């Protein structure tokens, strides 16, 4: 160990000061503070070009002290494992890290995520589906660790470019956005992440509400400077606004992953342009005539049957559908964002109900003074 310390004091400016700290730490038998020093050196402004050499040094130190912090060591040495960049032996490297630390802490599950990430990079058929599913299967009795949860959210968000998960991939991407609040990475990449999530909602079918991303400031402010037409389109999907010209400009604004599914964009916006009538009018206008449908969705007469059919299937409107008068009864069982800036409308309706109830209560009291007085 003293010989390795003497050799390790070289190969970097400012390193021997940390190496002297490392010498003091194992002299007094410190492991947690050693991991912080290892964390500081790895996150030092250097590329860690000697990835193999530092891997040997770190494994040398850990194996002759055998009392380091397990979860944080794997969180740090994983950077070296990824940087070595050889998947055929990287799988063996992850098995070696699993064997060196086989506890049920964050170490093993992080190793599983590293296995899944490697399978994305090369060999996207071996164990990809089993790995991603098993991460959630193993996050049991772990409500708020939030460390590997963010890891699992990141892999599955990068798994959006895979047949297995599109809507769920967007959901866990939102989960990543919630669990990690600070930016902690360039705004441009977050704006790209917002672009991918926006395309995920547009291409998806079951994402009718798709909440926490429509008017979310954390997602919109990333693209507040570029491609604001994406911000408007999501607001159109949220509040039921049609803006068919703008939404068509959305279709060919970001050509990849949108040109083929622009028809699905047509159906979803026609599906979601009726909700604005649904919550604004609490059965006040319960006659959804064909002309009213035409105003709301700018759709033909034959497509109304399919649109209201899909509305009943998803859960937008569940009322009776006639054709002699073409009247659609209004029940909604799938609420979504109601534009909290416009909460005055529901507040006014609620206070209208309060005034009516109190007035009738006083009226029946007036009719009942002959008993209650």
């Amino acid at each position: 160990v003293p010989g390795f310390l003497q050799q390790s004091q070289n190969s970097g400016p400012g390193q021997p000061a940390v190496w002297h700290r490392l010498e003091e730490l194992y002299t007094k038998k410190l492991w947690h503070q050693l991991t912080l020093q290892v964390l500081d050196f790895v996150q030092d402004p250097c590329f860690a070009q000697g990835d193999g050499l530092i891997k040997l040094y770190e494994n040398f130190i850990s194996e002759f002290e055998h009392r380091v912090n397990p979860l944080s060591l794997v969180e740090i040495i994983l950077h070296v494992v990824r940087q070595m960049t050889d998947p055929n032996v990287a799988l063996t490297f992850l098995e070696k890290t699993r064997e060196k630390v086989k506890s049920s802490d964050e170490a093993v599950i992080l190793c599983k995520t590293a296995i899944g990430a490697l399978k994305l990079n090369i060999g996207d058929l071996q164990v990809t589906k089993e790995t991603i599913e098993d991460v959630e299967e193993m996050l049991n009795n772990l409500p708020g660790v939030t460390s590997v949860h963010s890891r699992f959210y990141d892999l599955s968000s990068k798994y959006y470019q895979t047949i297995g998960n599109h809507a769920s991939y967007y959901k866990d991407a939102l989960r990543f956005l919630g669990c990690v609040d600070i930016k902690d990475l360039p705004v441009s990449e977050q704006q790209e992440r917002a672009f991918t999530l926006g395309l995920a909602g547009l291409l998806g079918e079951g994402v009718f509400n798709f909440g926490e991303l429509l008017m979310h400031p954390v997602l919109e402010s990333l693209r507040n400077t570029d491609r604001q037409w994406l911000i408007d389109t999501l607001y159109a999907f949220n509040s039921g606004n049609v803006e068919r010209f703008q939404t068509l400009k959305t279709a060919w604004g970001q050509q990849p992953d949108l040109a083929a599914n622009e028809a699905q964009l047509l159906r979803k916006i026609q599906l979601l342009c009726l909700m604005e009538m649904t919550f604004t009018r609490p059965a006040n206008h319960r006659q959804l005539t064909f002309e009213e449908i035409a105003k709301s969705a700018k759709i033909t007469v034959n497509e109304v049957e399919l649109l209201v059919m899909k509305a009943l299937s998803v859960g937008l409107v569940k009322g009776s559908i006639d054709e002699v008068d073409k009247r659609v009864h209004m029940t909604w069982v799938q609420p979504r964002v109601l534009d909290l800036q416009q909460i005055k409308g529901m507040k006014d309706r609620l206070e209208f109900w309060c005034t009516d109830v109190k007035s009738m209560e006083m009226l029946v009291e007036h009719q009942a003074h002959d008993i209650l007085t």
Partner: protein
Amino acid sequence: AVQKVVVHPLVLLSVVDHFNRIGKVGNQKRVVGVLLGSWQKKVLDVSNSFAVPFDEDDKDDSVWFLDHDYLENMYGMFKKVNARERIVGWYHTGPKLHKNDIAINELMKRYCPNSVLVIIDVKPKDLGLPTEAYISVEEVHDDGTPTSKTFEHVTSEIGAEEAEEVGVEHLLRDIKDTTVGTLSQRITNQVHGLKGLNSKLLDIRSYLEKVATGKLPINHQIIYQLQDVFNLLPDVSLQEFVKAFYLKTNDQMVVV
């Protein structure tokens, strides 16, 4: 994990007396103990109570003490005299909940896996609420929101303990809280029913107004998901009264 809880009319007064008897020297306003009972069919019930002196400091809400050996001895004695009784949760007064609850729940959950919190308003009798139930859920606040504590309220209803009807009738023997005097009593039933509806719905209107002002954090992600359907449910259509013009008016005219 429990579907709902049901509180007996058996422990509410016992907790209040325990608050009164141990508040003589402890003016912390904070009374903390454990509620014992049984959970059988996704319905949790409380059958016994116990209070422990408990002091707090506002500094990060981490200054406290209990008598755990005495409390554990109580549980063994209670289980020995009645095996079916088990600690269903731990209770704290002072409905303005502080931050030590997470530390208390972590310590006491070794007695009950689904640890729950109970708040008893000894002095407050706001409308009719004797106590409130709380469930600990920290499994991510929501799909796209940051981490939080988020202690939710599992639905609680006052149950009907057996053999206590004799005692409560003998105790009060003055108000006769029953359907006695059917016409007048139902009038009183209609009176405070309107009073309760007006008070609670006014509170909902105030919450909507305060959300509009934005002075408080907005929990919209469940507020509009639960109130939108409430608003849009078509109970205002009068054409079903047209279809049912004789909804009962025939029974009204025969009774005449």
